[PDB]
């Protein structure tokens, strides 16, 4: 055995951990962008409905 082999071995696992975590973080960014656009399509739609009512 060798502690270098230990480092590579554990880095397989750290690769999995960090990469899944950061892929989900990128999904959180996808939320911040497109789910933000969806909350726009909802709330601004209600605002626009208000303005038709008023007109």
């Amino acid at each position: 055995l060798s502690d270098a082999d230990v480092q590579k071995q554990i880095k397989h696992m750290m690769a999995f951990i960090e990469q899944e975590a950061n892929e989900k973080a990128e999904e959180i960014d996808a939320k911040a962008e497109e789910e933000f656009n969806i909350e726009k399509g909802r709330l601004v739609q209600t605002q626009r409905l208000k303005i038709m009512e008023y007109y």
Binding site: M14, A32, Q47
Partner: protein
Amino acid sequence: QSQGIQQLLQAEKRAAEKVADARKRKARRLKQAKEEAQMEVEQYRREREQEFQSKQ
């Protein structure tokens, strides 16, 4: 292999910190985005109000 042990325990913290702070800053991102775009849309609607009032 102790170097690896400690630095990769540190790597567990990279994943957790980045995910957790991304999640907690998603609230900030969404709230800022609301604060911007929807009020801007409000202002466009009031401009359009002035237009139709001119026609009226």
